[PDB]
Design a protein around this motif. Structure first.
Motif, PDB file in Angstrom:
ATOM      1  N   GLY A  41       0.797  -1.205   0.000  1.00 54.98           N
ATOM      2  CA  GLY A  41       0.000   0.000   0.000  1.00 54.98           C
ATOM      3  C   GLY A  41       0.838   1.267   0.000  1.00 54.98           C
ATOM      4  O   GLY A  41       0.840   2.021  -0.973  1.00 54.98           O
ATOM      5  N   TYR A  42       1.618   1.469   1.066  1.00 53.32           N
ATOM      6  CA  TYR A  42       2.474   2.653   1.196  1.00 53.32           C
ATOM      7  C   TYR A  42       3.375   2.890  -0.013  1.00 53.32           C
ATOM      8  O   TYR A  42       3.657   4.040  -0.366  1.00 53.32           O
ATOM      9  N   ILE A  43       3.827   1.806  -0.639  1.00 56.03           N
ATOM     10  CA  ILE A  43       4.662   1.876  -1.833  1.00 56.03           C
ATOM     11  C   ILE A  43       3.888   2.666  -2.884  1.00 56.03           C
ATOM     12  O   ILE A  43       4.404   3.595  -3.505  1.00 56.03           O
ATOM     13  N   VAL A  44       2.635   2.264  -3.073  1.00 57.42           N
ATOM     14  CA  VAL A  44       1.729   2.871  -4.031  1.00 57.42           C
ATOM     15  C   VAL A  44       1.547   4.347  -3.696  1.00 57.42           C
ATOM     16  O   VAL A  44       1.482   5.187  -4.599  1.00 57.42           O
ATOM     17  N   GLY A  45       1.578   4.662  -2.406  1.00 58.83           N
ATOM     18  CA  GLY A  45       1.428   6.031  -1.956  1.00 58.83           C
ATOM     19  C   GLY A  45       2.438   6.949  -2.621  1.00 58.83           C
ATOM     20  O   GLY A  45       2.120   8.098  -2.953  1.00 58.83           O
ATOM     21  N   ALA A  46       3.648   6.439  -2.842  1.00 62.29           N
ATOM     22  CA  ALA A  46       4.725   7.198  -3.473  1.00 62.29           C
ATOM     23  C   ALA A  46       4.644   7.177  -4.997  1.00 62.29           C
ATOM     24  O   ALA A  46       5.152   8.079  -5.670  1.00 62.29           O
ATOM     25  N   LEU A  47       4.010   6.152  -5.555  1.00 63.17           N
ATOM     26  CA  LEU A  47       3.844   6.099  -7.003  1.00 63.17           C
ATOM     27  C   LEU A  47       2.787   7.098  -7.434  1.00 63.17           C
ATOM     28  O   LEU A  47       2.690   7.466  -8.604  1.00 63.17           O
ATOM     29  N   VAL A  48       1.974   7.509  -6.476  1.00 63.20           N
ATOM     30  CA  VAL A  48       0.946   8.487  -6.733  1.00 63.20           C
ATOM     31  C   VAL A  48       1.601   9.858  -6.822  1.00 63.20           C
ATOM     32  O   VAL A  48       1.234  10.665  -7.669  1.00 63.20           O
ATOM     33  N   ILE A  49       2.569  10.133  -5.954  1.00 60.42           N
ATOM     34  CA  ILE A  49       3.267  11.414  -5.982  1.00 60.42           C
ATOM     35  C   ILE A  49       3.948  11.522  -7.324  1.00 60.42           C
ATOM     36  O   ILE A  49       3.916  12.579  -7.944  1.00 60.42           O
ATOM     37  N   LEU A  50       4.564  10.429  -7.774  1.00 60.71           N
ATOM     38  CA  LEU A  50       5.180  10.387  -9.096  1.00 60.71           C
ATOM     39  C   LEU A  50       4.075  10.688 -10.096  1.00 60.71           C
ATOM     40  O   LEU A  50       4.101  11.697 -10.800  1.00 60.71           O
ATOM     41  N   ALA A  51       3.044   9.853 -10.051  1.00 60.63           N
ATOM     42  CA  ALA A  51       1.912   9.947 -10.960  1.00 60.63           C
ATOM     43  C   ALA A  51       1.360  11.359 -11.096  1.00 60.63           C
ATOM     44  O   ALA A  51       1.419  11.970 -12.162  1.00 60.63           O
ATOM     45  N   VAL A  52       0.914  11.919  -9.987  1.00 62.98           N
ATOM     46  CA  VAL A  52       0.355  13.250  -9.968  1.00 62.98           C
ATOM     47  C   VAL A  52       1.349  14.331 -10.381  1.00 62.98           C
ATOM     48  O   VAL A  52       1.011  15.211 -11.183  1.00 62.98           O
ATOM     49  N   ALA A  53       2.568  14.262  -9.858  1.00 65.15           N
ATOM     50  CA  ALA A  53       3.601  15.243 -10.200  1.00 65.15           C
ATOM     51  C   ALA A  53       3.915  15.129 -11.692  1.00 65.15           C
ATOM     52  O   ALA A  53       4.427  16.072 -12.308  1.00 65.15           O
ATOM     53  N   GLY A  54       3.593  13.975 -12.258  1.00 70.30           N
ATOM     54  CA  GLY A  54       3.805  13.732 -13.673  1.00 70.30           C
ATOM     55  C   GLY A  54       2.659  14.290 -14.482  1.00 70.30           C
ATOM     56  O   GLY A  54       2.830  14.694 -15.631  1.00 70.30           O
ATOM     57  N   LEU A  55       1.473  14.291 -13.885  1.00 72.99           N
ATOM     58  CA  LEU A  55       0.288  14.826 -14.539  1.00 72.99           C
ATOM     59  C   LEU A  55       0.474  16.341 -14.595  1.00 72.99           C
ATOM     60  O   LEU A  55       0.345  16.967 -15.652  1.00 72.99           O
ATOM     61  N   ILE A  56       0.886  16.909 -13.466  1.00 74.95           N
ATOM     62  CA  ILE A  56       1.136  18.338 -13.358  1.00 74.95           C
ATOM     63  C   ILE A  56       2.279  18.762 -14.264  1.00 74.95           C
ATOM     64  O   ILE A  56       2.178  19.784 -14.943  1.00 74.95           O
ATOM     65  N   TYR A  57       3.365  17.989 -14.282  1.00 75.53           N
ATOM     66  CA  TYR A  57       4.502  18.296 -15.146  1.00 75.53           C
ATOM     67  C   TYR A  57       3.964  18.345 -16.571  1.00 75.53           C
ATOM     68  O   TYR A  57       4.183  19.327 -17.288  1.00 75.53           O
ATOM     69  N   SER A  58       3.216  17.321 -16.964  1.00 74.35           N
ATOM     70  CA  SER A  58       2.657  17.277 -18.308  1.00 74.35           C
ATOM     71  C   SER A  58       1.623  18.381 -18.525  1.00 74.35           C
ATOM     72  O   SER A  58       1.340  18.758 -19.663  1.00 74.35           O
ATOM     73  N   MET A  59       1.055  18.896 -17.439  1.00 77.32           N
ATOM     74  CA  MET A  59       0.088  19.983 -17.535  1.00 77.32           C
ATOM     75  C   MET A  59       0.836  21.252 -17.937  1.00 77.32           C
ATOM     76  O   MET A  59       0.478  21.915 -18.911  1.00 77.32           O
ATOM     77  N   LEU A  60       1.912  21.555 -17.214  1.00 74.64           N
ATOM     78  CA  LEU A  60       2.728  22.739 -17.475  1.00 74.64           C
ATOM     79  C   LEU A  60       3.405  22.758 -18.835  1.00 74.64           C
ATOM     80  O   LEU A  60       3.300  23.730 -19.563  1.00 74.64           O
TER      81      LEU A  60
END
Lengths: 46, 46, 46, 46, 46, 46, 46, 46, 46, 46, 46, 46, 46, 46, 46, 46, 46, 46, 46, 46, 46, 46, 46, 46, 46, 46, 46, 46, 46, 46, 46, 46, 46, 46, 46
Positions: free
Chosen positions: T24-43
């Motif tokens: 679970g917690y592992i996934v918690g960090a893949l989300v930060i990657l995920a979201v920060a990647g969505l935002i990066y791709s947003m910018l």
């Protein structure tokens, strides 16, 4: 003179005869050891 | 003459008989080793 | 004649009995390995 | 007859106990890998 | 009985410690990639 | 009759004692492996 | 009775000592990989 | 009557004494194995 | 008539007595073997 | 006639008794091996 | 009548006395065997 | 007529009496053999 | 009466003396076994 | 009347005296057997 | 009594000595593996 | 009176003398056994 | 005529009686051997 | 004791050395990619 | 008295001598294993 | 016979349990990657 | 003529009888060895 | 004593020698991969 | 007096002689074991 | 008076003489036993 | 003759039985890995 | 004395010889693995 | 006087002669043991 | 003249007859030894 | 005068003759022992 | 004297001969393992 | 003469027979390992 | 004189003969071990 | 002889059977990845 | 001596042979991947 | 002499035979892995 060591000839023969029985039956029990040892070594083997 | 090595015939037979018991029950414990070894190897396996 | 290989019957039984204890408790530690290995592989996995 | 495989019961328990320590602290270092890997993947990501 | 898995406690700690160094310095180079990539994308951009 | 298997009680104890030393110091070197392996995996990682 | 497992204390120590050398120098080559990999990724990057 | 099994008391003691020497020095060589094995495993490791 | 096999009663007793000494001290050296064997197996183990 | 093989009944019993001590304490050291082996395998594991 | 079997009482006593010497010193050499056998078994052991 | 074979009755009795002494003390030395033989067999045994 | 079991005292001593030689030199060859066995185990080891 | 069984007293004494010589020197050769037997058993031993 | 387990002291030492040679030269080949593995991983890397 | 048990003194001496020869040469063959046994154990060893 | 071989009947009986004592007590020491041998075999066993 | 992990020091060094060659020449080809990519992007650009 | 255990001194020496040959040549074949194992591990490696 | 692989049933369960935590917690960090990647791709998008 | 070898018939029977006791109880201790050996092999096994 | 671990010195050397061949030729094929990968990436590139 | 224990000198020599033959040829078969064991270990090795 | 016990002096001498022959040749056959026993023990040995 | 290897038939069966439990539950944890790996790959995917 | 360990010299040599065959041909199959692995990696590569 | 101990010279010779036959043929059967033991050890070996 | 050695013919016959009884029953007890020895060897065997 | 000790010459000859029969047939039974002992040792061997 | 240890020369030879058969055919099955292992590793490889 | 080693022929046969049972059923459990290992490798695979 | 040790020649021959049977059939069971061991190693292998 | 590797035939079959289940269901989740990846690429596409 | 490692020569050859089949057919499926990947990249391309 | 190692020739053959079955069927399951792995890689591919 003389000395009929003929009953020796015979009686010693029976001595041989029974030693064949003990000599045989004895072996009968060394086989149980033997085989039970093969099996023991079979089990500890695998 | 003679020598009744007949009680040998019999008594040696019981010797065989008990060696069958020890020979058997002994194996009973090699199985616990055996199986506990299969299980041990099962756990360390995966 | 005779030979009461009956105490064997019993005593060997306890041998089996304790090997069940060691056989069991031993496994108890292979589980810690096992599980700690699952977790280790969990962490290195992601 | 007998055989007090009771000290086994206990001593094996400590074996379990330390494997819990190594099993734990070991994981402590897989986390540094893990996290440093998340961060590495964070940087190479953007 | 016993087993002083205390030097483990410590030594594993240094393992963590250096992985923090490699884990850090490694990142130092991903930044050069990162930034040189931002700049590369800056130039090709306009 | 008798048989003072008391010096056994003690001497076996030291056997345990040194196996605790070897058992410990041995582990000391598995940690160097362990940690150097964590670090190796740290470097090849990133 | 006794058993001087003291030379163990020491000799195992050197074992640790050289594993520190191999453990170190080994890493020396993982850095060449590491860095040459950073550079490789630098070139393919832009 | 009597029987001075006192020189036994002593002489057996030296037997113990040398077995401590062989018992020790023997271990000295198992350490070379041990350590050279740690190092071997160190090298093949990374 | 008679025959005082009473000094036998006693003297045989001492025979038992010293065999207890040799029987004991002998074991003292089998422990050095035993323990040095546990340690040997400890070292070759890890 | 007769032959009081009754002191045998008893004395053999103590033989059993001490073999229970050696049989037990011996195991005490196989546990140190055992556990130190579980731990060794724990460390080399991760 | 009479018969002074008193010098027997004494002289037999010395017989006992020297058999104690041979009985003792003899044992002295069985110890060298014994111990050299413990050591031999020590060396072949490890 | 007559013949007082009464002093025979008595004197033969003492003959018996001393043979009891020699018969006894003799045994005293067979015990030293016996016991020293038990001990000898004890030492060569282990 | 008497019996000078004094030459026994001495001569048995030499018996001890040579058993020390054989007891020693014998060991000399168990060392070649021992060491060649350590080396054999060294080679097959790595 | 009389009968000087006094020269008996003396002459029998020398009989004793030489039996002490043969009794002694004889033993001298049983020691060579004895010791050569200890050594023989030493060699076949190891 | 005695037993010069001094040639053991020495001879075991050489055992150690050669195990140092095999222990060393062996490592010499693990380095070829090691390095050829670093290079292999270098090539497959980029 | 007398009895020159002096030729005994001497002749028994030679008895000792040859038993030294047989006692020696005999050992010569136990060495071939011994050594061939060391070598046999050397070969089966490795 | 006659011959009262009745005191034989009795006296031989005591002969039997003491042989029962020696026959018994003797066994008492074979048990110490026996048991000390079981224990010796117990120790060398594990 | 000892272990000359000095040839490691050196041999690992060459490992580093060749990885510098592959690490270099490899880059030589990433430049052809790189430049041919700059040119490709030059042409498609205008 | 005496016993020339001098031919032992020598003959045991040759025993040592050949065990050096077998001890050596034996190792010669463990090297083929060793090296062929290094090469095998070389091939499966890359 | 038997083998209570019941503690396995349980302990393996916790293994599952923690892998759920890491899982679970592992996934918690893949989300930060995920979201920060969505935002990066947003910018980089606009 | 005659010879009542009938008390033989009986008395030999008891001989058999006690050998059944020793024959039995003896086995009682071989079981402790046996089982303690199964357990020893159980522990060293896993 | 001795042990000519000199043929080891040499034979291990050849082990090194061939691992240099496999170590080399192996690389020969990683280059085909490498280059064919550079070319593949060249084509997919433009 | 005398005793020509000279034919002993010689005949024992042949005893030595044949033990050299059996001692040799015996070894011839331990080599087949040895080598076939090296080869067996060669095959199972790779 | 007189009595020429001079032919005794001589004739007894021959008695000695032949006992030297039988005493010798007898030994000749004990050597065949001896040696054939060394060889028998050689074969059963290995 | 005989040997009831029937309890083997059965007991081995349970060995199979528990290996089915460990074999099963073990898999239970590989699924958590598996699924958590699918999810991990799901997140890093998009 | 002697012992022609010369047939060892030779026969061990053939052992070496065949291990060279198995050692060689074995490698022949590791090459098929090796190459088929290079090709497999070639295909999955592009 | 005289005594032709010449037929002894001869007849003892045949005694030697047949002991050579039994001494030989006996060995013939120890070889079957020997070889069947080499083969047995061959099979259990691999 | 004459001498009726006919009662000899008969009476000696009974001598034979009872020796058959003792000869038989004696064996009856050697069987208990025998069998108890087979069983003892059965237990110590496995 | 005279004395025809010629019938001695002859009659003693037959004495020799039958001792050859008993001497032979006796051996016939030692062979059954012998062979049954070879076979017994064959079975217990493997 | 003599002892024709010539049938040994031959019979031991056959021992060698069959060990060559078992030594060979045994290897025949290690090849099936070997090859089936190469193939197994082939499949799991790709 | 004779010796009916025919019951051997048969009884050894059953030994073979049960080893076929243990040899078979044993394999039955190696399959559970085998298959559970295939499945384990199936899950960890994907 | 004489002694027909010719029945020895023959009877010993049968001893050889049956040892060939036991020697053979015994091997028959070592093959079941052998093969079942090859198969066991086959299964655990893959 | 024999070995019913028929239960292998079957049991391995189920191994195949479940690997078909895991092999199938596993794929079931790769499809969710697959499709969710097609959709993800669909959205980012337009 | 000898050892026909000729069946190895051949059998290993087939091992090579099938690895060529698996080595080939395996590739057959990597082509489907390969081509389906070229096509996939074709479609996503335009 | 002799030893029919012909049943070996055959029985070992079956060993080979079943290892061909296990060797085959085993592979049957590695194919399911293999193929399911090709398919898994097919899905994750596109």
């Amino acid at each position: 003179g003389v000395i009929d060591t003929s009953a020796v000839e015979s009686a010693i023969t029976d001595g041989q005869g029974d030693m064949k029985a003990i000599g045989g039956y004895i072996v009968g029990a060394l086989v149980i050891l033997a085989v039970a040892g093969l099996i023991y070594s079979m089990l500890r083997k695998a």
